[PDB]
Design a protein around this ligand. Structure first.
Ligand SMILES: OC[C@H]1O[C@@H](O[C@H]2[C@H](O)[C@@H](O)[C@@H](O)O[C@@H]2CO)[C@H](O)[C@@H](O)[C@@H]1O
Ligand SMILES: OC[C@H]1O[C@H](O)[C@H](O)[C@@H](O)[C@@H]1O
Ligand SMILES: [Ca+2]
Ligand SMILES: [Ca+2]
Ligand SMILES: [Ca+2]
Ligand SMILES: [Ca+2]
Ligand SMILES: [Mg+2]
Ligand SMILES: [Mg+2]
Ligand SMILES: [Mg+2]
Ligand SMILES: [Mg+2]
Lengths: 612, 613
């Protein structure tokens, strides 16, 4: 027995944590903030927004548009489930988030930016989205350098968004259609992926006629112009055949690189032509009862297993298509129960039928180490530290087990433990169907405002050098921010002393010499002695780090060391560090430890430690 | 700072030798502990002598006692190289054998197990050394009708772990240990109840037995290589305590006498490599170090991982041991190895001296001087306040420890922070063995605890009680202040010397003078007539014999005997002269007795205090 409503709620929420750009004031978390704010600056176009692809920060438009098209398809099929669960606003905000970005990516007729970020450079750094420091180049396709698959996948997303938004926001629906029409025209004129090269190694395209059909079907549903339905059907002979036959491929499943499964399902419902009915049932039969002596492999515990990478992604996506098709009056009657049983068995495997959940922050023993940079929240550019994720990325469906149900919840296992937009796409639609059928209430007013689990900015210190007339401190400030991760360019700290002995010597405490033999950072400034509470002879040295680009993204990047000394005159012996507030407990060597008596300030406001 | 881990290890093992009850070996390396609890088990007609006293008291509580020896054996099983290198292997094996020989005695027939000797109330109502305890020490047992699963299983774990470490050098003993371990484990397993475990209520109540069952089963598997036991160990896991609002195995406490699931799951991870156990032990170790999912054990400002008010050092050093063992296993998450090893060192260093003082008795800088311990203190008057210092150094004892703000006071009745106990040193010993392996520190060669005797053991105080023209009457009080070892002194006598030249000169027989006693405290006190000492020089004496008197260092009245005696010249005469009498010189003239050195005291005829003419 599983709570499908809560699963649906979290699956939709997952996308909110993948958001790039200027985040809404109404966001329900305290650990994601503005990021990729300069996206498109290299080309002079505002390309901010959209979703980060997986556990990384590249914006790959092919799987991104596949995702939003699939979410819109679910809303088109099961609006009643979203309304009943109270999740309609959230899934529509997600669909609009992706589509607003695709619109920005088509700034002028005939031009389409299909990517922001370099796979290699982006993947070479392990840290939060908010503090990325590397270049994020924009890439585009046009008539001279075509991208049929990505243009058509984007048109499908835009057109499907138009279908589900038309009732409540007819103007946005028209806006989506205008851009879908342009991108489809680009894809249809070109019939080539030759200029779609920036995603090589990550989302290279192996087919585009499937995307042309899928986009044409959605443009037909969005505009009711039969010109599109005729085009949709015209590409069918060009879809890849099953190896060793002259039959439309049926041994794989709906995914970001192959959408002919969804296109044929939709063409079956729209035309009732036997060709489409036979094709989709051949695929669904292969995945369930088996067909013509062949069948997708099943793990011992009941998972329809298609491939090593994202096994759950494949199974839950096929579950969604099986659910949609089983509801159609044209489905072979005897297969309705078979397909519906399949939808339930596969979704249940993801939610907990093996004894544990494969959905982050949901169910029994959910994964705790998904391969995801921002949810982990390292501040040292290390997958290994901290040894636990600082944030809970609710709703994320992990890759999944191997062919024998084997699974290792480790952060470095990106084959079976990464999470991604496309992984949750079909999954979300299958969950909506299970919810409408078996229920399970979503958590009321669900938010992801987390407790701060570690001091965000800390200071470590130790006695570096000492003498009869001086004290020399080694201090290191650390940015361990996570709610949200952020640059701390206004940090300072204060070192307090009791100078009663200086006053007793007839010496002005303000005349003591302060100095610094070493400091990381160009802006580090150590002040002279300043009064704090002279009635109790308390003075201090202010160490200002304002201007320093301290950020949680590397061992050096997150810290600033400062060695400073305060000294009475040469030959004197009255200097007494033992009555100094900041000296108490201070480590006796240059081995530094966290101290609570050399307070840290952020723009003058105390955030760590204590004052006298 | 740098700490000598080998010396710490050698002393921590030695601590248990000072906790020994029973017929002590002739090989003992101290001069202040001796035979005690020699009638243990007499109330039931079973030899239950031996084993270790629990803490600063003399009750034998088998649950923490067996937890202790099981933990020592675990350390020897994990780090035999450390014991061999430090030359401590023999000493730790003798300790493990001491406990286990007693547990064997406690399982005299299959199906019966004596789990305690001593009544908490009777034992704690007297403050004195083990050797002279006078109270009844009842024995308590569990059986099928009145079960004790936790104590039977903890004892089985001890016996099975002993077998594992003794198999190579003494297979016959290992075989005997296994036989008893199997019976105690079977009793525990079949009963699954602590209903009959009642005599330790308030001291060592059991809050769980499924943990003990897995712990015992794991050790029986290691001792026998019979997978039947591994299957059993794993079967109790679903019944182990869980974290409050989850279905996750408990992880917010630590390994201790009442909860051994931490040690059991750590060993199960190493023996099976199952993710469940790895996850479980790492959640516990993470809670104790870096924290896990917004939760971490409290830490004092000076670095001590602080779990609870009682035995804060006990808990921290035990977790240090587990961290050290786990960190060395190939299965440990690579990125946590250094965190765990750092923790092992930081906690042990806190115990040894990182705050500026040591929390280990007789070790390092400014060690505790007043641990809550009857025998080490050595009162001879049933007073926690007297003497005002400890007469003995109980080397190696780890005190309870500071509060959560590093506060600590070294006082005898700071029974919380200054308590010392078997379980407090168990995990600690294992952690020290790991640190010695990692960083060395040379133990003291052939270290012994032969103490200098710091107070005269049997003394006499005297004063003038009455005087007249023909007599001297003395008030004398003999005191047993024995401590090396505390002991009954039933053969004490003393001699009062006089010069009777004036009696002889007056023409009176000196051997005819009337001697008498107007008051004697004991029924066996005998005052002789005048006897010759050196007749040539007119020196004579009176012998006062206290032989038969059960004088012992365990109370104000118990440790002393007052005797008043008088020697008289003939009635009406005035030539008696006490001023030329050796024993009269400097004698307190009032009656308020003061220690004197001219009325020599003898023990079985041998002078032990004072001087002869
Ligand atoms: O492309 C596969 C996954 O790579 C992940 O980044 C790796 C990178 O590929 C390695 O070469 C190396 O740099 O370590 C990185 C971190 O594991 C990337 O984070 C995933 O999103 C990719 O799917
Ligand atoms: O911690 C393991 C590794 O994780 C990521 O790949 C980081 O980019 C790399 O710097 C680190 O060494
Ligand atoms: Ca394609
Ligand atoms: Ca000062
Ligand atoms: Ca227990
Ligand atoms: Ca005389
Ligand atoms: Mg804003
Ligand atoms: Mg990838
Ligand atoms: Mg002051
Ligand atoms: Mg003997």
């Amino acid at each position: 027995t599983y709570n499908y409503g809560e699963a649906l709620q979290k699956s939709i929420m997952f996308y909110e944590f993948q958001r790039s750009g200027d985040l809404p004031a109404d966001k329900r978390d305290n650990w994601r903030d503005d990021s990729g704010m300069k996206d498109g600056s290299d080309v002079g176009v505002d390309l901010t927004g959209g979703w980060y692809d997986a556990g990384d920060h590249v914006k790959f438009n092919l799987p991104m548009s596949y995702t939003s098209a699939m979410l819109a398809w679910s809303l088109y099929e099961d609006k009643d489930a979203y309304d009943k669960s109270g999740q309609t606003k959230y899934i529509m905000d997600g669909i609009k988030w992706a589509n607003d970005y695709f619109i920005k990516c088509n700034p002028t007729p005939g031009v389409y930016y299909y990517q922001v970020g370099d796979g290699g450079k982006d993947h070479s750094w392990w840290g939060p989205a908010e503090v990325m420091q590397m270049e994020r180049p924009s890439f585009k396709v046009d008539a001279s350098k075509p991208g049929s698959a990505v243009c058509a996948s984007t048109a499908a997303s835009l057109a499907s968004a138009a279908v589900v938004f038309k009732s409540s926001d007819p103007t946005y629906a028209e806006k989506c259609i205008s851009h879908a029409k342009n991108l489809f025209d680009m894809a249809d004129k070109a019939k080539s992926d030759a200029g779609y090269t920036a995603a090589s190694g990550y989302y290279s395209s192996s087919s585009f006629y499937d995307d042309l059909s899928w986009a044409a079907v959605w443009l037909y549903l969005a505009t009711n112009d039969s010109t599109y339905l005729d085009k949709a059907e015209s590409y069918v002979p060009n879809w890849g055949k099953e190896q060793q036959t002259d039959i439309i491929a049926y041994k794989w499943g709906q995914c970001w690189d192959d959408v002919h499964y969804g296109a044929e399902l939709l063409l079956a419902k729209l035309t009732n032509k036997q060709l489409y009915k036979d094709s989709i049932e051949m695929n669904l039969d292969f995945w369930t009862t088996g067909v013509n002596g062949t069948r997708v492999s099943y793990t011992p515990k009941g998972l329809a297993w298609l491939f090593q990478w994202g096994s759950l992604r494949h199974a839950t996506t096929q579950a969604f298509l099986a659910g949609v098709y089983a509801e159609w009056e044209g489905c072979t009657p005897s297969k309705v129960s078979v397909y519906k049983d399949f939808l339930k068995s596969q979704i249940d495997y993801a939610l907990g039928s093996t004894g544990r959940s494969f959905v982050v922050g949901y169910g029994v023993n959910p994964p705790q180490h998904p391969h995801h940079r921002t949810a982990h929240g390292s501040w040292t550019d290390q997958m290994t530290s901290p040894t636990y994720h600082r944030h809970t990325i609710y709703g994320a469906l992990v890759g999944g087990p191997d062919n024998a149900d084997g699974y290792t919840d480790e952060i470095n296992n990106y084959v079976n433990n990464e999470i991604a937009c496309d992984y949750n796409a079909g999954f979300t639609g299958a969950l909506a169907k299970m919810y409408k059928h078996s229920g399970g209430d979503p958590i009321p007013n669900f938010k992801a405002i987390e407790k701060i689990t570690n001091d965000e900015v800390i200071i470590k210190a130790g006695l570096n050098s000492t003498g009869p007339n001086y004290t020399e401190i080694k201090a290191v400030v650390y940015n361990q921010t996570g709610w949200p991760a952020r640059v701390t360019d206004k940090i300072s700290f204060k070192y307090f002393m009791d100078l009663s002995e200086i006053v007793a010597a007839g010496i002005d405490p303000l005349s003591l010499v302060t100095s610094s033999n070493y400091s990381e950072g160009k802006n580090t400034k150590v002040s002279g002695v300043l009064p704090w509470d002279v009635s109790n002879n308390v003075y201090y040295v202010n160490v200002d780090l304002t201007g320093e680009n301290i950020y949680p993204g590397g061992q050096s990047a997150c810290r600033r060391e400062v060695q400073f000394r305060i000294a009475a005159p040469q030959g004197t012996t009255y200097w007494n560090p033992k009555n100094d507030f900041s000296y108490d407990g201070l480590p006796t060597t240059s081995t530094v430890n966290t101290v609570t008596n050399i307070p840290v300030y952020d723009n003058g406001v105390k955030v760590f430690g204590n004052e006298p």
